[PDB]
């Protein structure tokens, strides 16, 4: 018979940053920080809820928009402190975006009305 | 000055085809993608050359939506292998994308029994 | 209360095959070498000064065509003895390739008037 394994992933991702500041507090800093810092992204990067690996101190992050998300990822791995055997993923509206795309592209084709990027990241 | 000559070259023929006829094949593809109709179904074999260890079973039923990417620690804690050791799967001998869901490559490639073939091998 | 998180790559790398091995020799040698193995092609692997991890002892190879850019990495991280942790990077001009790209395809694309293929790698 059929060995069943992984699962679906839910869209039901919620972020605290959005949750914590009113949509116009929200677009005012994303389009400050654009502003101030034109050559990266605001990024939030959360924990999705059945991700089994380690939290993140901080959430809000300025990328610079040349980088890759296989980049991206070496440097939230380093920070997450994760053993090289386990694994790391980003979902945007859950879907995992190529390694080779430049966050800077993954920021123009997704970013919210508030000026942020918003990844969820976990081990599954 | 001399070059170092590393990596070799790589059509698979899957054993699983030999064991089963095609039309059981078939009439199992197709009642279970009945019965799953957010999964598919695939065929997991080791690639003859690869010096890792094989799978105990070869069938597995996998979200449409799952990644390569997801799917390779789903198998790869399955194989008796070492850390230092390298998996790589094949599609048709082509390595896909590691954000290619399991769902597409399905759609692109299930074979006429509805299901999809995947070797795998190390380096 | 952002977190600024990676640095931009200004694009600066020069190779020392280049600067050690006149042109007309390296063309010579990568015509004939194509000529005699047509499934390999030529590489030159170099660190780039910036990266913190260890050098290649040889830096020229003949990888197969069909050879992904995900095993030649497999097979370089394992010549540097790099940590697990470490990350790896290749970039030809300047741009990380997709690791399901085959070594053949770059070439294609890229190899230069002495048909040699640059690759730098780094560790960001």
Do not use: C, W
């Not at 394994?5 to 800093?29: C, Q, T, W």
């Not at 101030?36 to 605001?42: A, E, I, L, Q, S």
């Not at 809000?60 to 040349?66: E, F, G, I, W």
């Amino acid at each position: 018979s059929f060995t069943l394994i992984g699962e679906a992933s839910d869209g039901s991702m919620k972020f605290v940053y959005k949750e914590e500041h009113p949509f116009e507090k929200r677009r005012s800093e994303g389009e400050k920080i654009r502003k101030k810092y034109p050559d990266r992204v605001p990024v939030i990067v959360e924990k999705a809820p059945k991700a089994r690996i380690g939290d993140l101190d901080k959430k809000k992050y300025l990328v610079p928009s040349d980088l890759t998300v296989g980049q991206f990822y070496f440097l939230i791995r380093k920070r997450i402190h994760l053993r090289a055997e386990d694994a790391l993923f980003f979902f945007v509206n859950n879907v995992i975006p190529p390694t080779s795309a430049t966050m800077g592209q993954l920021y123009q084709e997704h970013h919210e009305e508030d000026f942020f990027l918003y990844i969820a990241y976990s081990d599954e």
